Amino acid sequence: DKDLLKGLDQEQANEVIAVLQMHNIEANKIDSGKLGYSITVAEPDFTAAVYWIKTYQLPPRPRVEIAQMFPADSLVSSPRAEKARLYSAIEQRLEQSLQTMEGVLSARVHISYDIDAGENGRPPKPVHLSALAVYERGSPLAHQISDIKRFLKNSFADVDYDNISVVLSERSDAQLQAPGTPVK
Amino acid sequence: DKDLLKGLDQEQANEVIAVLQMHNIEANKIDSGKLGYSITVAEPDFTAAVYWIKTYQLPPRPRVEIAQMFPADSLVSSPRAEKARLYSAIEQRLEQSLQTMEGVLSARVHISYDIDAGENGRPPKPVHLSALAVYERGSPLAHQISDIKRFLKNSFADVDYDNISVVLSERSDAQLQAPGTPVK
Amino acid sequence: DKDLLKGLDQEQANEVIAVLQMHNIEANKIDSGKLGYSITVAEPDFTAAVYWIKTYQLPPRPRVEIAQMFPADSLVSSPRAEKARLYSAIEQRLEQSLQTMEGVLSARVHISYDIDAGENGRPPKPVHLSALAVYERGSPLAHQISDIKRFLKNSFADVDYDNISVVLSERSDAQLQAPGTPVK
Amino acid sequence: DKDLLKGLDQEQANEVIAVLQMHNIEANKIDSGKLGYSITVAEPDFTAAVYWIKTYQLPPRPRVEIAQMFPADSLVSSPRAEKARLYSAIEQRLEQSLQTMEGVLSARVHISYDIDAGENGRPPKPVHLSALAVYERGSPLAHQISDIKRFLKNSFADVDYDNISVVLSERSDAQLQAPGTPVK
Amino acid sequence: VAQNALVLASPVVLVLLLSEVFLGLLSRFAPQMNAFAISLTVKSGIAVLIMLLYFSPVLPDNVLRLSFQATGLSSWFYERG
Amino acid sequence: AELDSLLGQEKERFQVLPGRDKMLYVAAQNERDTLWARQVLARGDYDKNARVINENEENKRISIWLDTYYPQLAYYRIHFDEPRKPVFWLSRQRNTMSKKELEVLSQKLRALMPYADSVNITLMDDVTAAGQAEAGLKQQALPYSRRNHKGGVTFVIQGALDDVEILRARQFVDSYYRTWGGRYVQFAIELKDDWLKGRSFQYGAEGYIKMSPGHWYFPSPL
Amino acid sequence: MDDLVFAGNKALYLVLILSGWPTIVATIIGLLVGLFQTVTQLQEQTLPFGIKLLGVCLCLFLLSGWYGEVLLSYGRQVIFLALA
Numbered sequence A, B, C, D: 001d002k003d004l005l006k007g008l009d010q011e012q013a014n015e016v017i018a019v020l021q022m023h024n025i026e027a028n029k030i031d032s033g034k035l036g037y038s039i040t041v042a043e044p045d046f047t048a049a050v051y052w053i054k055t056y057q058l059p060p061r062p063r064v065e066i067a068q069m070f071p072a073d074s075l076v077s078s079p080r081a082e083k084a085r086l087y088s089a090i091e092q093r094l095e096q097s098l099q100t101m102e103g104v105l106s107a108r109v110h111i112s113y114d115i116d117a118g119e120n121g122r123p124p125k126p127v128h129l130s131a132l133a134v135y136e137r138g139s140p141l142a143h144q145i146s147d148i149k150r151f152l153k154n155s156f157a158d159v160d161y162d163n164i165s166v167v168l169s170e171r172s173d174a175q176l177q178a179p180g181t182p183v184k
Numbered sequence E: 001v002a003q004n005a006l007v008l009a010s011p012v013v014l015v016l017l018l019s020e021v022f023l024g025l026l027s028r029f030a031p032q033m034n035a036f037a038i039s040l041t042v043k044s045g046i047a048v049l050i051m052l053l054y055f056s057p058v059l060p061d062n063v064l065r066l067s068f069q070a071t072g073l074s075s076w077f078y079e080r081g
Numbered sequence F: 001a002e003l004d005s006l007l008g009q010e011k012e013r014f015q016v017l018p019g020r021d022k023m024l025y026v027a028a029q030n031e032r033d034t035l036w037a038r039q040v041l042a043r044g045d046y047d048k049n050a051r052v053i054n055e056n057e058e059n060k061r062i063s064i065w066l067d068t069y070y071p072q073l074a075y076y077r078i079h080f081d082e083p084r085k086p087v088f089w090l091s092r093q094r095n096t097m098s099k100k101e102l103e104v105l106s107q108k109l110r111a112l113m114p115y116a117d118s119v120n121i122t123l124m125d126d127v128t129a130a131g132q133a134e135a136g137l138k139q140q141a142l143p144y145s146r147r148n149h150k151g152g153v154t155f156v157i158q159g160a161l162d163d164v165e166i167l168r169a170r171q172f173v174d175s176y177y178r179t180w181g182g183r184y185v186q187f188a189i190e191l192k193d194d195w196l197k198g199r200s201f202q203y204g205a206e207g208y209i210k211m212s213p214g215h216w217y218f219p220s221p222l
Numbered sequence G: 001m002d003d004l005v006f007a008g009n010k011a012l013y014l015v016l017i018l019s020g021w022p023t024i025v026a027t028i029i030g031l032l033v034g035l036f037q038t039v040t041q042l043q044e045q046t047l048p049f050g051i052k053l054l055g056v057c058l059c060l061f062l063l064s065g066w067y068g069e070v071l072l073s074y075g076r077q078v079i080f081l082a083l084a
Helices: A010-023 A046-055 A080-098 A147-153 B010-023 B046-056 B080-098 B146-153 C010-023 C046-055 C083-098 C147-151 D010-023 D046-055 D080-096 D145-153 E002-008 E010-027 E035-053 E055-065 E070-076 F034-043 F099-110 F128-139 F164-177 G002-018 G020-039 G048-083
Strands: A003-008 A028-031 A037-040 A104-111 A129-135 A164-170 B002-006 B028-031 B037-041 B104-111 B129-135 B164-170 C003-008 C028-031 C037-040 C104-111 C129-135 C164-170 D002-008 D028-031 D037-041 D104-111 D129-135 D164-170 F016-018 F024-027 F050-053 F075-079 F087-091 F120-124 F153-157 F185-189 F201-203 F208-210
Touching (some): A003 A046, A010 A046, A010 D046, A010 F034, A028 D002, A046 B010, A046 F034, A080 A104, A080 D080, A129 A147, A129 B146, A147 A164, A147 D129, A164 F164, B002 B046, B002 C010, B080 B104, B129 B146, B146 F164, C003 C010, C003 C046, C010 C037, C010 C046, C147 C164, D010 D037, E055 G002, G002 G020, G020 G048
Parallel strands (some): B129 B164, C129 C164, D129 D164, F024 F050
Antiparallel strands (some): A003 A037, B028 B037, C104 C129, D002 D037, D028 D037, D104 D129, F075 F087, F201 F208
16 A cells, blocks of 8 residues: 555665565565556555664665776776776676685675875785675585685785685575465 | 655655654655655644654755765866775775675774875875674674674775774664554 | 744754744744745744744754865865865764764764864874764663764774763653643 | 566576576566566565575676776777786686586686786786686596696796685586476 | 876867867958967967866876886896896 | 464464463564564454563563572573473572472462473583583684683683684584573683784793783784 | 975966956957958958057056065065975
């Protein structure tokens, strides 16, 4: 009956359904053509559904990348604007290459940006890395912590094993069953 | 049938209802299409609703980023506005990567900005980090403070373990029941 | 039906009713379309309502930021005019991040403006901070003054614990009952 | 027939059906001409399909190359923007030349990029490699490490065996039976 | 140094040159203007004004960037015995 | 209808226990499934009284009663593996309650939980609680330091640990905590910057002397 | 560092305004006489210099009591930056 979000995109709409089914409320996705999607719920679940909107920050923002704020369309391009677009394509490709490993569902990698070392006589600093991962359950996740450190080590110039910090976890309990319709 | 806010939009209207529902009053959200949403309440609940607007300062302003004050569409860009455009995009990227840990619903991270050292003979200063987090309740949140400092250290050039401060808290109790209509 | 204000805004109208309802008088909000809102009271409560207009300096003028005097669309900006736009954007972002703590209803953060340290060959001075907050009634507000100071401690280069001042106070008593219409 | 996704192209749709069939559910790939493809599932399968969409981060993003950030249609190209387009074409050739070995099904190769040598007089550093692979199962994959590091060694100027890291794994178990339609 | 000369003198020579042919199209629209004489009076104010916009944030950092540093001393010399 | 059909498809994750005060208790197992069943009673499709109980939150609920009516009591943990006959692990070497005094406690603990039939009181040793804590902290080979005093022990793990020494530690603390609870023994995981993970010596005239465990640490340049 | 570009900017500011009023009077009478040369058929080349000469020097005559003052203020205040 009552609406709570409208005008969403495709990937913003699919996130709202997947959160509410975890909390035992059933919603409906209706397409509206060029005005994006819209999401409706029933009558008694409306008070609780807004509470989960505020905590989970729906609708989700589009994910931000570092190459968005330094566009290549500018006819001038400083060297601080070239290393930042060079780092930002390496830190998405190593994460996307990490998804082809054994048992990884998601990952996110961050690289240290160094731009002001070449302008003066100062030597360049060492480079640091960090990574997250969520593993499928049933895995001995104490023995899978040394292959990500070995693969990420000599993918760069010269790192140590203290500069690499990987912290990973097992996946959550699966949500598979239907919520159930509130009858009155 | 007494309005208190009209001309709103999509993200503000779903936050005012979730705050007022905490304080036991019902509400009806009336959309107006091009003019945005509108919110009406009942007549006995109007004297209390005006009081809860002034404390929570509704409607909420849109959230400000540092890269909004230095747009890339200018014809020229100072070097101070280029390191500020680099640092203000990583500050949003760490927020979307911290929400994929186990139990964190929301978080906010801050980085220390440096301006004067890049131009003069003075060496660059140390880097300081500070993070906030809201955890899912039922978690032993005294042991959750060590993976984040382990994650936050070597995501940068040169930080130490005592320049990072984590302050975290479990989320509040859930609100699932309806406010109730005032009978007279 | 004597009117006392007209041509008001939407944000201007919910604050005046919050003031008058504290002093046991009831006002009516009238929409006039493009000309703004208007507020009328009864006849015997007109002498008292004029007294409360002078005290609260009503209606409230909108809040001012330092980056409103220095717009981003200026065709030439001195380096004196970029760090003033930079510190004013950090304290607008720091204020929204403090509002996501446990118990905070409102907050305001000020930064010390030391921008003339670059004129001479001297190293720059320290940076000083001062914050205000209004907490929910029932909280042990003595233990929550060392947490906001710890979170604010390493958001800059190097501050001390005696350059920060936190002045906080519990909120006022709630006003929930209706004022009551007079009879003649 | 609850609709899950619409507007995908050819290569995005074949990955969605290959993931859902691992979890005992089937889909229908309906063509729509110019509007790409669309994927619909039944109603009891709708709750489960939205769980595996968020976890596997479907739909997949298109894979990124470093040569996309530096286009060859610019007027002038810096030497920094030439070794990035040179190093990006060898590593696309190195993983297609790895598929003509025996046993291998997929591969991903990463090169360490030189950044500071374009503007400085410092001699360049040693180049580090890292590779991933998927082997057809049953193979003695212990004796298979000595051929790829030997092949990868003298494809550059001067590397050593402690700077090459190969982390490989056998493919997952085969899926050969149909899911089965859910009758209810 | 020449390719560092042309790109540093890049933005001010394009506006002065485009203004002249824009003035030249008005001399084709009004024949006895003698826009060559008018070109000398107006260009010295224009050629200095556009470079004031990027004088502050752009010139003095290229000065420190272009200072030759000691690390490049290996590439210009070698001893012979 | 009935409540055990108003839940999900599988009748395997919940358990409906009948109460003595004409209520119907629902026994979940974790926090995520608690809001799945609390949403049902909140939307109001049930004409009778019902409550959703939980192992994590009713072990903390009847400790608020315990530190008002029974101060200076030595106890560890309440286990709800069989929710009609719970087991109360009481301490032997720190209590003075007699046999007649434990029986008033078995009835006064019965009155707070109306669904149960009888509470079984058993006695654990205070020295087998620290033997399992020392052997598990030594099986993972972690540098630590024990500080014995009267009425509780504490284990402190400092130093610049790597990413491996945190995952085996964080998987171990919550599995000892599920058995005993954080009333007697408390862990003190903390990250500071010294490659000497916890230990500290002073050097003079004969060799090295092991200093006392203190709060101050030398920060490491290396 | 910040004062050097700041001294340079007002130095670059002063040359824009002091050549401002002589050049704009030498502009508009170079165009208003040219449009007169179109509506009245006049093909002499050395016309506009005679109007342009007395037009700027009167503006210099009327503003020579103004020109020296902004220079004496700027030159005096830069030496205070030089020593202290």
